[PDB]
């Protein structure tokens, strides 16, 4: 288009022949607006507001002041195809994303913008509907090209379609509800140019769901629930001294990624394994990629100078996925965890589903023909700062039983942090199973490695502090280091008392965790 | 203690002197009024129960083929029978305990837990005549009484028993029941082979007035009023051919449960969520468990060889709440269930309900769509596309809507009234059976006579809503007309404005958003 300049590097977007925008902008949201139910009608974010906000919405520059003091030679960088996959995404969010990309990315480095309709059922995105999307696209450069799936395949399914259709040496995947900051793609391209084996991910800022205000705020690990988790304080303390507070312009390696939003050399991406194409809908596809990448000769970095705003959803869901899809994706990811899969399996509930075993083994066959390294290696070199680097760091996993009263601890059915622990009759169920992390002395319910027992008799969010460090003595006591008192089950009440090996009420029996050397997947 | 067949636990309830510790009452009076006696007894004739023996033999209701089975008692897991009760009469409560001990081998019965849910009767009291507490001393040690300081409800009372149970398996029973031979043996074997199975005995009946033993429908669905309903005729026909006439000895799956008489592995039960302990007093806890059980990796089966007789009898806010909480497990279908029970707006404890929404997602429980397509695919509404119309049936010519006239119960006539946009003027359509029904009662069906009647899945209730807007009845090929504020059938003709109706389309959201408080 024409009108090129700073702020609209691809020209004035969204103008018809007449010269007036082809987007009917909405008036200010109502005064009599109920916010808690609007975040459901909008599918996670306030849509009355997004519809009233302009598609060419300026956004503050969130990169560090030192990041702006850089220079990139556009003529010497490879072009890249940005891929935006979307399903039933509202018009305002989807176009504001495309606008933000086209407005803030030089055309010299943007080969194309591929939009992937993953079987949307909205009338504006359907080819048997009002045709608002397709019609409006003619008002965008040819770079922007829409492609569809006749049926919803999921993130993995839709993302491969975009990458497979991409034409550039590099692709950059983005969400359909995003806004970028200046020079967001330039750092990624330069980094992948010098080593095609690097998968680089931008730092993700936020667009508030309710207010749409721009909110600011690199190393990311994982939880044994098979969820991404940001490096905590005690984990950043285990870092090498010179990497504990890296500079704002440095590329920092990350054990894991936050799911989507990354750039990668297309050829390499297909040679390090693309995406397990049996992963369904939403799920843990971000870890299988993270684990697989590192073990098979790749690098995962984050560029603090490449920042992108993202609408994290709140009090609502944008789409509906089946209940089994999440467990399947986790089971398949456990293939890359080797012996540690035994623990991951118990945290997610020792589940047994149809994880498509036939195709999962062919990935194991692929894994061995590629010579990919082990997860123990991964844990010892890529994520050595984790609380569980070896399965010896989980010495006890099982019921915490007091023989005197003949009972064991019980989460009372809610393993989520915040509620109180009670004494009940032992039935050997997951509700009465507890594991121990010796690196931080955390006593946690098996089904949630974020909940930690405290002297108060209740669970709370696990922090690697003196407020959660427990000691399991040789006598069998649960001693709390800070106060140096031991936990007693006297009268079916949880109390702290002077430690004393003669008090049978404070002697506990905790099963030892001596799992196998190799995890054998379940049956179907 | 004198043990043998018929009294597998020995002679129960005898004092040291050698005389029963229960004074039987004489035959009920001849000048007895049944309606007044069935009131003092609380549902069942208590004058008779008091005169009936606690060691009352009962006919074996099991199929003759069920008796040709063999169980090795030494290889079966012990089970804790839990009987919860509130203000249950002595005779009925004890005849049950006697029947259990009399018809259950001691090797497989770890204990029998009696749960007093805050009874206020003098015989059940720590400050009363102490009839129950004393008489229990004359029963084996297996029998253990425990109480709740205040009436907590079924959910509250049953959990107290399950938590107090010490056996790998528990069996929940009513306080007014009598068992058949080998009632517990089939259940234990089934749960031993797969701890994920929740097995239910088939329920026979004890008449309330005469106390006759009555023979007893193993497949159970549900209504959009959130009530269990036994598979109707047209529903059993949608079953696969190999399950339309199941054998008397085969275990048959049931989408839902009809009251809380079931056995389950204790560990499994607590991992499948157990019972929403925010459910209050009596209510629909049987469906919330059923939906949750199936979606979270469990099975609900019925054992036709395990039979139990049950004496069927003859606050209000708790019930609406329990239904709201159950709708959490229905996903988008809650929109339909919500309008059928009257768009209620109450304090459903929206806080603790979210902990279930997280609990459900942390467990990876499947969707209600899955449930309806795999567990209850024989239902009349498998998808919300099976309910295409929901709204007033309006005739623009006379400017009126249909009206249930304030009753909605089957049997009453439909009249024509002026549209006010209320629930009494709302009607939904089930396309699998062509039922025109009032929204507040999916058991009432429009008929050509101009009246509602019990919905039966027959050609006698199948309506067709044409593209022109007519209500055509398939059997007679006649259309409904509102000529003269009267409902009558006329030869169909799209040019007649009196037989053209406007019915709102039902295109609900993709996810149900609960109301506020
Ligand atoms: O079956 C699906 C599910 C999601 N998405 C899209 O994938 C992108 C990433 O998912 P999402 O943003 O919902 O994940 P989040 O980052 O919010 O956790 C979004 O544009 C979704 O609309 C898709 O195309 N198909
Ligand atoms: O607040 C209550 C109400 C009832 N029950 C007992 O729970 C059992 C099942 O209740 P209900 O009488 O409704 O059984 P149904 O008659 O529906 O089979 C009976 O033994 C009741 O006495 C109880 O423990 N607490
Ligand atoms: C910190 C991070 O990267 N992701 C968090 C995750 O750890 C946490 O369990 C979840 C629930 O609050 O929210 C998200
Ligand atoms: Mn997103
Ligand atoms: Mn943390
Ligand atoms: Mn009953
Ligand atoms: Mn019926």
Residue numbers in the entry:
A (entry chain B): 102 to 318, 322 to 628
B (entry chain A): 103 to 318, 321 to 418, 426 to 628
Please give the exact wording used by the authors of the publication that reports this structure.
O-glycosylation of the protein CST1 by the mucin-type O-glycosyltransferase T. gondii (Txg) GalNAc-T3 influences cyst wall rigidity and stability. The strict glycopeptide-preferring enzyme TxgGalNAc-T3 then adds GalNAc to acceptor Thr one position N-terminal to existing Thr-O-GalNAcs and is predicted to sequentially O-glycosylate Thr rich repeats within the mucin domain of CST1. The structures reveal a unique GalNAc binding pocket that dictates the substrate preference of TxgGalNAc-T3, which is coupled to a 2nd metal binding site that is strictly conserved among apicomplexan homologs.
To investigate the basis of the substrate specificity and function of TxgGalNAc-T3, we solved the x-ray co-crystal structures of TxgGalNAc-T3 in complex with Mn2+, a non-hydrolysable form of UDP-GalNAc (UDP-2-(acetylamino)−4-F-D-galactosamine disodium salt, UDP-GalNAc-F) and each of the following glycopeptides: CST1.4, Muc5AC-3,13, Muc5AC-3, Muc5AC-13, and SRS13.2 from 2.2-2.9 Å resolution. We modeled UDP into the active site but did not include GalNAc-F due to weak electron density, either due to the high mobility of the GalNAc moiety or hydrolysis of UDP-GalNAc-F during crystallization. For the mono-glycopeptides, we observe density for Thr-O-GalNAc in the TxgGalNAc-T3:Muc5AC-3 co-crystal structure, but disconnected and weak density for the peptide residues. Overall, the lack of density for the peptide backbone or Thr-O-GalNAc at the C-terminal ends of the glycopeptides suggests a lack of strong interactions with the catalytic or lectin domain of TxgGalNAc-T3. Thr-O-GalNAc at the +1 position on the glycopeptides is bound to a pocket in TxgGalNAc-T3 consisting of His333 (catalytic domain) and Glu554 (lectin domain) that interact with GalNAc via sidechain H-bonds, and Ser334 (catalytic domain), which interacts with GalNAc through a mainchain H-bond. We observed density that appears to be a 2nd metal (Mn2+N) near the GalNAc binding pocket, a striking and unexpected feature not previously seen in metazoan GalNAc-Ts.
